[PDB]
Scaffold this active site. Structure first.
Site, PDB file in Angstrom:
ATOM      1  CG  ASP A  72      -2.321  -0.601   0.973  1.00  0.00           C
ATOM      2  OD1 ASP A  72      -2.543  -1.306  -0.027  1.00  0.00           O
ATOM      3  OD2 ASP A  72      -3.216  -0.390   1.828  1.00  0.00           O
ATOM      4  CB  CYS A 128      -1.081   0.987 -11.485  1.00  0.00           C
ATOM      5  SG  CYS A 128      -0.258   2.468 -12.264  1.00  0.00           S
ATOM      6  CB  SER A 129      -4.595   3.866  -9.087  1.00  0.00           C
ATOM      7  OG  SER A 129      -5.842   4.546  -8.867  1.00  0.00           O
ATOM      8  N   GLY A 174      -1.988   4.799 -13.949  1.00  0.00           N
ATOM      9  CA  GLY A 174      -1.339   4.368 -15.179  1.00  0.00           C
ATOM     10  C   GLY A 174      -0.003   5.047 -15.496  1.00  0.00           C
ATOM     11  NE  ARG A 232       1.391   0.349  -6.863  1.00  0.00           N
ATOM     12  CZ  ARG A 232       0.408  -0.012  -6.040  1.00  0.00           C
ATOM     13  NH1 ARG A 232      -0.436  -0.957  -6.397  1.00  0.00           N
ATOM     14  NH2 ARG A 232       0.252   0.597  -4.862  1.00  0.00           N
ATOM     15  CB  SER A 233       1.631   1.565 -15.452  1.00  0.00           C
ATOM     16  OG  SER A 233       0.383   1.038 -15.026  1.00  0.00           O
ATOM     17  CD  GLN A 267       2.259   7.854  -9.541  1.00  0.00           C
ATOM     18  OE1 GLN A 267       2.141   6.682  -9.176  1.00  0.00           O
ATOM     19  NE2 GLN A 267       1.291   8.722  -9.413  1.00  0.00           N
TER      20      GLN A 267
END
Ligand SMILES: Fc1ccc(Cn2cnc3ccccc32)cc1
Length: 282
Positions: free
Chosen positions: A181, A215-216, A218, A221-222, A262
């Site tokens: 998380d 991901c959320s 994009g 993680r993406s 990010q």
């Protein structure tokens, strides 16, 4: 500089934030006018994450062709990826329309539906074989065929049917379920194992349309997923693998979608993944 020793030099000097801010300063800025039209406000999860006009995916629809999704085309590596946000309640039908129209084989999901007590994307696939989903706005049917749950990820076989033509296709859903998380994983080993499973399936290969990854938002993680994949492929292709410059590859990818990677912690994790992955390849 090489990668592994540039890595230790940034660790010892504690300058990851300064490296990451340089990337942010040098990154491309291109217009995203379609994303900001008022009629598309409920098609965007975050107001500060938009596709550039020149690289956005267009839906084959004459009313409104907009989806928050970008084509990342890597010329030297000969790989393409579609990076997109986690679908919203009012964009699940658009999402599967894109998968159909772009001839993708695989969907890569790097988030959980709920994280930190809030919803990060819609429940956009069926959870039981006998309870299929119908998307009436785009005339598609989606059925769960099989599911294989492992300790770090789950693979699902799905059937997507175009109800207008009765054509059917098999889609593979690769779901990484254990990203924390907060922060990044301590070791890249399970992420790399997951990447290799996606590769082995054929979903990244030229005989299919581009893989869809999300991901959320994009971008975080993406971005880590496609950056690691492309860097490892270039290390296999070139005469001198130490010439591969992960910062330059990231800036190339940011010509096609804003904001990839990010945080400075995601940057460090991307270096770690490529470094460890290059040892296993040989
Ligand atoms: F893009 C890739 C190219 C090769 C591999 C090799 N590999 C396979 N499973 C692994 C587990 C831990 C570390 C490495 C690993 C991975 C990704």
């Amino acid at each position: 500089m090489e990668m592994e020793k540039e890595f230790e030099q940034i660790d010892k000097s504690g300058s990851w934030a300064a490296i990451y801010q340089d990337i942010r300063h040098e990154a491309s800025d291109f217009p995203s006018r379609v994303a900001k039209l008022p009629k598309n406000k409920n098609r965007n999860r975050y107001r500060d994450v938009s596709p550039f006009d020149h690289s956005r995916i267009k839906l084959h629809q004459e009313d409104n062709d907009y989806i928050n999704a970008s084509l990342i085309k890597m010329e030297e590596a000969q790989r393409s990826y579609i990076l997109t946000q986690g679908p919203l309640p009012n964009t699940v039908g658009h999402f599967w329309e894109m998968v159909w129209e772009q001839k993708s084989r695989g969907v890569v999901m790097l988030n959980r539906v709920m994280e930190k007590g809030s919803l990060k994307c819609a429940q956009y696939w069926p959870q039981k074989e006998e309870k299929e989903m119908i998307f009436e706005d785009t005339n598609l049917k989606l059925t769960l065929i099989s599911e294989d749950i492992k300790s770090y990820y789950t693979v699902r076989q799905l059937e997507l049917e175009n109800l207008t033509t009765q054509e059917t296709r098999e889609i593979l859903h690769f779901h990484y379920t254990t990203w924390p998380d907060f922060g990044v994983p301590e070791s890249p080993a399970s992420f790399l194992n997951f990447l290799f499973k996606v590769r082995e399936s054929g979903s990244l290969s030229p005989e299919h349309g581009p893989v869809v990854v999300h991901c959320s938002a994009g971008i975080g993680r993406s971005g880590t997923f496609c950056l690691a994949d492309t860097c490892l492929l270039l290390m296999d292709k070139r005469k001198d693998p130490s010439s591969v410059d992960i910062k330059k590859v990231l800036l190339e990818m940011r010509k096609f979608r804003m904001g990839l990677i990010q945080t400075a912690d995601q940057l460090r994790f991307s270096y770690l993944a490529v470094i460890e992955g290059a040892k296993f390849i040989m």
